């Protein structure tokens, strides 16, 4: 069961936080979550890893991943979204044991609109 990444289309006003939810279950307690934006070259650019001990040293603070209380839903928030954050995003869920598996969500679109 690959993770779900919702909403499929998210429209936010520039300056607001843009918050997706990455969801997955039926996986072991030993997991890693990755948050990607699709680049102009159709390449996955890693925005954030969860938990914190998986983060690249230069991970930008504006990409916030929070595990919600039920432990299966995760908020993935762009803090103070800008017009140029408009694009395509997805999450990857990695199970580590007893079998290691990588599964990507379907892509979701973010549109960040002009504030009037």
């Amino acid at each position: 069961n690959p993770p779900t990444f919702s909403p499929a289309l998210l429209v936010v006003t520039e300056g607001d936080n843009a918050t997706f939810t990455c969801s997955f279950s039926n996986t072991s307690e030993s997991f890693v979550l990755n948050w990607y934006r699709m680049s102009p070259s159709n390449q996955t650019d890693k925005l954030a890893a969860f938990p914190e001990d998986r983060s690249q040293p230069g991970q930008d603070s504006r990409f916030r991943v929070t595990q919600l209380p039920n432990g299966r839903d995760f908020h993935m928030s762009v803090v103070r979204a800008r017009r140029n954050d408009s694009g395509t995003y997805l999450c990857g869920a990695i199970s580590l044991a007893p079998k290691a598996q990588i599964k990507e969500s379907l892509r979701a679109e973010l549109r960040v609109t002009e504030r009037r």
Partner: antibody, heavy 119, light 108 residues
Framework: QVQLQESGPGLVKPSETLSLTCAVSGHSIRGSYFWGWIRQPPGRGLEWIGSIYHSGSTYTNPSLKSRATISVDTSKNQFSLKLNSVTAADTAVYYC????????????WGQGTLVTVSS | DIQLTQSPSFLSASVGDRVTIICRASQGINNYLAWYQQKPGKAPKLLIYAASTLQSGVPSRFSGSGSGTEFTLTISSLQPEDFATYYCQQLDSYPRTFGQGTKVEIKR
């Protein structure tokens, strides 16, 4: 980065229990990684013994499941190996490690400790 | 469980030679395989992960290729300091397994 150090007796009598501890430095065992024991008999290959998550959930080599216990003490940032009923076949350098996985770029190994099984 | 067949067992090659080491997995494991260098009296040291990704800081003469069952470690230009036993490790599942190892000695 991360440093690991094996400790325990270098000489165990046949039929007794081998006990080793791994002291982890530079980062907490509490986290998203598995922590493993690997051994190498003199001049032979690497054999994975078992691994443990900070929660205490373990995986053990099927060949050693009857004799081997992996344990973790997050209170002391250590994990440990007990191997019962030792024989000359158990003479080896014992390594503790942060297990490599497909979600990282790096692992970490102790220097290894020799255990000789002899009367 | 994953079994690994590593070949060859031992090789002697000259400084500057291209060295080829192979690990065959008992079933498809995607690119979930790592290559290690073990110098005598030292812990195994990671060279390559995800079958073909050189760990940043490892010399560029080390490369990996393959996905599924057949994995290749290449040393493009053998150096005297490359004397070691090389091991593959599968990362596909517990129980963890290593190749039998390839001992590399320098012909001079």
């Amino acid at each position: 980065q991360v440093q690991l150090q094996e400790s325990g007796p270098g000489l165990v009598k046949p039929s007794e229990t081998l006990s080793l501890t791994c002291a982890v430095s530079g980062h907490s065992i509490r986290g998203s990684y598995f922590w493993g024991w690997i051994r190498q008999p003199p001049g032979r290959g690497l054999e994975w013994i078992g691994s443990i998550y900070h929660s205490g959930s373990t995986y053990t080599n099927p060949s050693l499941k009857s004799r081997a216990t992996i344990s973790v003490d997050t209170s002391k940032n250590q994990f440990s190996l007990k191997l019962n009923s030792v024989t000359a076949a158990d003479t080896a350098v014992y390594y503790c490690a942060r297990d490599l996985d497909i979600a990282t770029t790096r692992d970490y190994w102790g220097q290894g400790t020799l255990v000789t099984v002899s009367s | 469980d994953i079994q690994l067949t590593q070949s060859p067992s031992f090789l002697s090659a000259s400084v500057g030679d291209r060295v080829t080491i192979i690990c065959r997995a008992s079933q498809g494991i995607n690119n979930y395989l790592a290559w290690y260098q073990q110098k005598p009296g030292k812990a195994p040291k990671l060279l390559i992960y995800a079958a073909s990704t050189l760990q940043s800081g490892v010399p560029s003469r080390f490369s990996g290729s393959g996905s599924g069952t057949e994995f290749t470690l290449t040393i493009s230009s053998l150096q005297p300091e490359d004397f070691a036993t090389y091991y593959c490790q599968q990362l596909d599942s517990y129980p963890r397994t290593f190749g039998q190892g390839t001992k590399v000695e320098i012909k001079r």
